[PDB]
Amino acid sequence: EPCVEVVPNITYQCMELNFYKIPDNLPFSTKNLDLSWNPLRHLGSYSFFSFPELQVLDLSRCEIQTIEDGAYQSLSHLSTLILTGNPIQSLALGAFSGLSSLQKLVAVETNLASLENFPIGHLKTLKELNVAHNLIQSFKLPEYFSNLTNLEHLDLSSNKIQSIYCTDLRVLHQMPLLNLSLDLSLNPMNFIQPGAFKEIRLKELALDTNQLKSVPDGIFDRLTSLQKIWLHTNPWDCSCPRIDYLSRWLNKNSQKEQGSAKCSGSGKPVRSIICP
Amino acid sequence: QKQYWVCNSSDASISYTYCDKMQYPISINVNPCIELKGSKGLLHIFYIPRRDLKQLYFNLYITVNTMNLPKRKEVICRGSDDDYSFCRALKGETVNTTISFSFKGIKFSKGKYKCVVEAISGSPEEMLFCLEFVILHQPN
Ligand SMILES: CCCCCC/C=C\CCCCCCCCCC(=O)N[C@H]1[C@H](OC[C@H]2O[C@H](OP(=O)(O)O)[C@H](NC(=O)CC(=O)CCCCCCCCCCC)[C@@H](OCCCCCCCCCC)[C@@H]2O)O[C@H](COC)[C@@H](OP(=O)(O)O)[C@@H]1OCC[C@@H](CCCCCCC)OC
Ligand SMILES: *[C@@H]1O[C@H](CO)[C@@H](O[C@@H]2O[C@H](CO)[C@@H](O[C@@H]3O[C@H](CO)[C@@H](O)[C@H](O)[C@@H]3O)[C@H](O)[C@H]2NC(C)=O)[C@H](O)[C@H]1NC(C)=O
Ligand SMILES: *[C@@H]1O[C@H](CO)[C@@H](O)[C@H](O)[C@H]1NC(C)=O
């Protein structure tokens, strides 16, 4: 094969080999297949019917722009599926069908604007979905999230999100055992509406390197299981009594915070401000 | 009710009194002395904890003339590498530190200022002591 072999009948790296179509001169038991940087442009029905045994698949930067129903149809054992940097624009409302075993799913920078039309709905076994560096402005998990009864990490960093509203995390209410970690870093966020996290169960929450100047008194207060939280490198306003709520909260949850949210202009830790 | 004079100053005077049964010794030197309208200085402290300063933190009970501010917790010594050297202080160890401090003024008020500072730390957190700090005013 013009491909490379790292593990016989197991792992092939057909990377950078100018393919225009899915090879197949590769064993039928292959388990790990890297097809990154190959002008594949379109993935049509059954695009992989020759690898019923794949586990990990990489299709990073493959200029793909379309994926239709059953594209991965017989990849029952697929756990990972990296679809990074692919100018997708049309996405089959059946695209991922057949991915019964999927667990991880990178979709970094795949020109996404909203998870509303992101057909992962039936991806029950999914464990982590990274849709970082995209074009999402409003982040409002849609109903289908319900079926994501195992999702434990959801990255949404570096998008175009400027604000967190109530509704935005709603569906989670109906998710009791959800030990979800949620990353929302490097976003143009500067507004979190009150009641946003009320009655929600986040294990880890990251709101660092955004543009928050202040938050709503009690915004976290009723946030079950929260073990880690990032709030550093933000343009925090340390004026009394505004900052008060947080300054306290942090002190109360010191062990929870990672890094130290500081004061804009001051540089002084927020947790050091005792207001009158 | 044995009052201990900390430091008399141009804008006020400081003093404290134990608010706990066991009344262990403490050398608290503020230098210079707090100026109620703002000033920095060196809080100097000599003590000797009965408990490992590990998770050391103060519960502050401030009370300005007319009102008092809810119970505020202020952590010192997180499990961090950034903590003040003394967070290493085990039980019977001597804590002879000095610490910089900067007090940003209070604008126009002479009433007496009463602040209680309940110290807590060590594995199962316990009270290391309590101190009632009274600070009287008379700008001349
Ligand atoms: C404030 C340092 C005083 C040093 C000398 C203290 C002498 C005896 C202690 C008595 C209790 C003092 C309690 C002070 C509480 C107020 C803190 C504060 O300044 N907050 C302002 C606040 O200050 C912010 C922080 O500045 C500094 O930190 P940073 O530079 O990182 O930000 C301040 N820190 C410092 O200047 C240095 C330190 O705290 C180091 C303390 C080290 C303690 C080590 C103990 C070791 C013990 C070892 C053996 C176990 C922060 O205060 C920390 C207070 C800890 C008190 C512990 C006392 C233990 C005594 C043990 C014997 C302040 O929040 O600024 C606000 C404005 O922000 C824009 C002020 O509000 P305003 O804008 O409306 O004016 C705010 O002041 C508002 C008035 C205040 C009441 C003031 C009452 C009178 C206090 C007179 C001393 O709050 C109601
Ligand atoms: C997310 O976290 C929740 C809540 O912390 C997890 O629920 C917990 O699940 C365990 C089972 O893994 C329950 O324990 C059960 O009872 C005893 C344990 O003492 C054991 O004999 C049983 O075999 C079984 O393990 C536990 O009661 C239950 N809730 C709690 C905390 O009381 C859940 O597993 C996690 N799920 C996800 C999606 O991460
Ligand atoms: C390739 O896989 C086949 C299928 O079992 C096996 O016959 C062959 O030995 C493998 N390659 C070798 C010789 O290692």
Author numbering:
A (entry chain A): 27 to 302
B (entry chain D): 19 to 158
Task: Please share excerpts from the published article on this structure.
Toll-like receptor 4 (TLR4), a superfamily of LRR proteins, is the principal receptor mediating innate immune responses against infections by Gram-negative bacteria. In an attempt to prevent the systemic immune response caused by LPS, a TLR4 decoy receptor was constructed by combining LRR modules from the TLR4 ectodomain and VLR. The constructed decoy receptor was shown to attenuate the TLR4-mediated signaling process by trapping MD2, implicating a potential therapeutics for bacteria-induced sepsis and inflammation.
Phe-63 was substituted for tryptophan and leucine for the interaction with Ile-66 in MD2. To get detailed information on interacting interfaces, we attempted to determine the crystal structures of three single variants (M41E, F63W, V134L) in complex with MD2 in the presence of Eritoran. It was shown that Eritoran, derived from the lipid A structure of Rhodobacter sphaeroides LPS, is critical for crystallizing the decoy receptor/MD2 complex. We obtained the crystals of three mutants in complex with MD2 and Eritoran. The F63W mutant /MD2 complex structure was determined at a 3.6 Å resolution and the others at lower resolution. Even at this moderately low resolution, the density maps clearly reveal backbone structure and some side chains. The complex structure of the F63W mutant displayed that Trp-63 was closely positioned to form a cation-π interaction with Arg-68 on MD2, confirming our design strategy.
